[PDB]
Amino acid sequence: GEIAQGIKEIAKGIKEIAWGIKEIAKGIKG
Amino acid sequence: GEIAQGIKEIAKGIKEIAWGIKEIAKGIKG
Amino acid sequence: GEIAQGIKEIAKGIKEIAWGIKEIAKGIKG
Amino acid sequence: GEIAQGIKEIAKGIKEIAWGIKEIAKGIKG
Amino acid sequence: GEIAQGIKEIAKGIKEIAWGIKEIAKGIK
Amino acid sequence: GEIAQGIKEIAKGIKEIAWGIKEIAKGIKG
Amino acid sequence: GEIAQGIKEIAKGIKEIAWGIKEIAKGIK
């Protein structure tokens, strides 16, 4: 259960990186 | 099943990062 | 236990990357 | 099989990130 | 034990990436 | 064996990201 | 053993990313 929870927290962090990269792409296009 | 679901969510986030990086590459090349 | 702890430490580092990427996006946006 | 498939999808997305990063390096060198 | 050690070495490297990214954000600012 | 192969494919893609990041560093330093 | 070896190769690649990101931060600075 602690392994499944760690993996889910990785997935959450990866989604937050994807959001940040999209914000960089928008900044560059500005 | 929760481990397989976490790994699939990581894969989804990584694909969204790939899309964002490609958008940055296109923005810079503009 | 050591595997679950290592995975949690990966998740912590990935969150720190997400914060850094957000700070880059803010810098680019001015 | 679902775990092996998720891991393979992570590998595919990571290779797509590598391609994008190489295109950023090309854009900067322009 | 070799798997746990490899995972811990990934964690260490990811933290060092985080520090570098923060330094980029400071450089841009 | 399918899990070991997926992990090795992730390792390959991570090395290709490392190469691209180094090419960015060289581009900027130019 | 093949799983432990793959994880160790990921750790090596992550450390090389960390080095590259540090070089970017130095370049911007």
Residue numbers in the entry:
A (entry chain E), B (entry chain A), C (entry chain F), D (entry chain B), F (entry chain D): 1 to 30
E (entry chain G), G (entry chain C): 1 to 29
Study text:
Expanding this pattern to hpphhph can produce larger α-helical barrels. In peptides with four L/I–K–E–I–A–x–Z repeats, decreasing the size of Z from threonine to serine to alanine to glycine gives progressively larger oligomers.
Conversely, both Gly variants scored more favourably as larger oligomeric states: the a = d = Ile variant as an octamer; and a = Leu, d = Ile as a nonamer. Indeed, peptide sequences with a = d = Ile are more unstable than their a = Leu, d = Ile counterparts. Although a larger oligomer was predicted in silico, the calculated internal energies for Gly@g were similar for the different oligomers. The hexameric and heptameric assemblies of CC-Type2-(GgIaId)4 imply that, whilst Gly@g is necessary to access larger states, it is not the only factor that dictates oligomer state of the helical assembly.
